[PDB]
Write a protein that binds this ligand. Sequence first.
Ligand SMILES: NC(=O)c1ccc[n+]([C@@H]2O[C@H](COP(=O)([O-])OP(=O)(O)OC[C@H]3O[C@@H](n4cnc5c(N)ncnc54)[C@H](O)[C@@H]3O)[C@@H](O)[C@H]2O)c1
Ligand SMILES: NC(=O)c1ccc[n+]([C@@H]2O[C@H](COP(=O)([O-])OP(=O)(O)OC[C@H]3O[C@@H](n4cnc5c(N)ncnc54)[C@H](O)[C@@H]3O)[C@@H](O)[C@H]2O)c1
Ligand SMILES: Oc1ccc(/C=C/c2cc(O)cc(O)c2)cc1
Ligand SMILES: Oc1ccc(/C=C/c2cc(O)cc(O)c2)cc1
Ligand SMILES: [Cl-]
Ligand SMILES: [Cl-]
Ligand SMILES: [Cl-]
Lengths: 363, 363
Amino acid sequence: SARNEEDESCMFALKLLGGFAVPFTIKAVIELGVMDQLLTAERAMSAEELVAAAVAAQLPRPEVACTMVDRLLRFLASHSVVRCTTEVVVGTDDATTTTCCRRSYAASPVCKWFARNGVEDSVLPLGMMILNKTFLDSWQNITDAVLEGAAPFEKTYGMPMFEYLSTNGPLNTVFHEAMANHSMIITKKLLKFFRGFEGLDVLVDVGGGNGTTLQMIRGQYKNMRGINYDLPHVIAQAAPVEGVEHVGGSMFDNIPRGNAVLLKWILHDWDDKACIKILKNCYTALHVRGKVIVLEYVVPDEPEPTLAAQGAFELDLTMLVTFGSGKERTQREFSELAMEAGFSREFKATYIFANVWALEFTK
Amino acid sequence: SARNEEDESCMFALKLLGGFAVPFTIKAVIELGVMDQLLTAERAMSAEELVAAAVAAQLPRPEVACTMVDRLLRFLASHSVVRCTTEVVVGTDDATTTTCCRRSYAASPVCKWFARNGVEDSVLPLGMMILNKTFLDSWQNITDAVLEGAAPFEKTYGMPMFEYLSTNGPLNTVFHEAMANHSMIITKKLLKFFRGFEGLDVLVDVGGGNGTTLQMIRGQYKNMRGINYDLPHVIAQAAPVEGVEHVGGSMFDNIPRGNAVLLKWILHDWDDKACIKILKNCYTALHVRGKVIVLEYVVPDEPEPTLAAQGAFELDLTMLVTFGSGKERTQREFSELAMEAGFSREFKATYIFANVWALEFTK
Ligand SMILES: NC(=O)c1ccc[n+]([C@@H]2O[C@H](COP(=O)([O-])OP(=O)(O)OC[C@H]3O[C@@H](n4cnc5c(N)ncnc54)[C@H](O)[C@@H]3O)[C@@H](O)[C@H]2O)c1
Ligand SMILES: NC(=O)c1ccc[n+]([C@@H]2O[C@H](COP(=O)([O-])OP(=O)(O)OC[C@H]3O[C@@H](n4cnc5c(N)ncnc54)[C@H](O)[C@@H]3O)[C@@H](O)[C@H]2O)c1
Ligand SMILES: Oc1ccc(/C=C/c2cc(O)cc(O)c2)cc1
Ligand SMILES: Oc1ccc(/C=C/c2cc(O)cc(O)c2)cc1
Ligand SMILES: [Cl-]
Ligand SMILES: [Cl-]
Ligand SMILES: [Cl-]
């Protein structure tokens, strides 16, 4: 009992230190093409069967590849990421790590989110960014960054992340593909569950990229016109989109005038002082009865041990790593920034999807 | 609800991809000195108090340091690693990330396992190895290593781990300190929970280092003599230990004669053929009724979703990453190695601590 408490404590400590193993194993199973074979399978498949289906090339050590994949999948099975069944081996099977016993694996429902197909909703492009080595290396440098009051990313690479992307075309692509993926999913869910675009004549999308988000919204709200507001080098590359003015500039200088401003994953990149500048520009830009629509996660008031709360605090540490002073906020924190920027004590919150809320502040 | 099912599924997918954040956060809290302040505190302490207690040097941006630490500990609290209490701030406090509310933190029981200073009951040296950048970087190269049937470490660094350690003095130290730490903990638990040293006249300790393990065992069993059998260059550096003879040699060539041979975390580094060679050298070194004592994890016959099983399969993946063909084994697998090496069909297993079993095979 006391023996067992000591034992359980030590095992929990080791579990806490080893949490990187699941993500890194999933990454390999995806990259090998094995996850996609699980996703299109009609039945449970052995590691040998999955390797044969995923990998076109002749392998130099095919049995060793098979036994390594078996071990990767066994581990994922113990975490319920895949389903496993075990059958007795008749004869010799060198493609299982256990001579006696052959495992076959099937996808769990969660695995659809790892689809490379793209056809239904997947978060694989976002996951490619989450586990990108460039970004992961920053997490090893938190200590020194904290002692300097700096972003771990900047301590690691010597410049802010957004500048770094200008210097690294491949990472720039990873980052933009991740953002576009998350944006597509959230915009679809917004159109299903959120009613705050009703009645709007003009929506200003800050960071609107090539105008795809506005295009999708305008598709549900045919009367609405859009202002796609983004940096000049972005706006330069945007093709014409029906009903949308592409406008270049900086949101710290000015925001175009409209009936609502959309801020999707913008404010969490910035400290309070910077957020108040943005929101003051929103305030001055809006017409009366106008709204800022903020699409962000919302951290709870206290550190609750729920899946949703842990997710929000994990994004907070991602913002800490990436930006230092970027951060996730509580509902109260968002309201306080809004009030500092001049908005009224009128607050709407609508839950959208995957920890994202739509928060609305009104002039 | 199909909506809520889809939402939970997606959040779960993201949780699975992000599991590295907790280990990296724990590493930073340890490195900063904050964890050791939690361990010695008399009461809950704010991030500001903890940074003041942990960091003697003046910081360039001390308020930013404190808010970052607050965010690291808030995340850990959401994972039950520390306890958190929240009190209303009177005045203005800019060393909490939430200006309304100041959190204070206290160690949970698990935190004692992260203690510095080589203290009683810590796995910190082992943890240093677990989260070492050189060793972690191999986990990014699993896909390509599988395709070649190679160890990820060897794919990453261009040679096996044991060879590479010879060329990297800091990493060699990290490795040996980790092994020594785990050995110390397990040896103390053995002396508490394991019977099998009783009646032994001579115990051979393969990989016995400087003879510390045999020294501890002799502490309890005064009439037992020890042979410390390690690589010649390790033996060269071992100071005399009463009742222990230091002997240099390859365990692949032979093993010194004794009443028992101890193999701790040896077999799991090696494939079946290499294990059978070691155990056959053990068999020749023993007389009838001599024993091999194997200290290893034991993986279950099916991938059970337990804390214990997940820990054993995680070590299996560590072996895959480090050695490729090193692996964790089932009880059946260990029995089948012993019988191949000539041992009798006579098998004892005693659970020790932190997933380690003592398995005994008899000649
Ligand atoms: N970061 C801080 O510590 C902090 C604190 C207070 C205020 N600020 C304000 O933020 C500035 C930092 O930015 P900068 O000087 O490089 O200016 P900038 O206008 O070039 O903006 C830099 C970043 O802002 C974002 N951005 C700007 N306009 C945007 C738009 N229309 N759509 C989408 N994203 C847009 C982009 O991500 C870009 O990389 C400070 O100089 C100050 O004005 C910063
Ligand atoms: N896979 C195998 O069967 C295998 C592997 C390596 C060496 N060997 C044989 O061993 C002989 C010597 O070759 P080598 O010098 O390259 O091997 P070695 O003696 O260096 O042994 C290889 C590894 O075994 C471990 N080791 C060896 N003896 C040990 C001991 N007493 N205590 C703890 N760890 C120990 C070390 O990690 C070492 O790096 C050769 O005959 C070789 O073929 C066989
Ligand atoms: O939780 C844990 C995580 C990792 C480890 C590693 C152990 C280990 C043991 C060896 O003999 C060699 C090695 O290179 C690594 C143990 C426990
Ligand atoms: O589960 C998740 C893990 C990581 C992320 C990262 C989001 C993100 C958002 C930004 O606006 C900028 C950025 O650099 C990163 C989101 C979800
Ligand atoms: Cl092969
Ligand atoms: Cl520009
Ligand atoms: Cl400061």
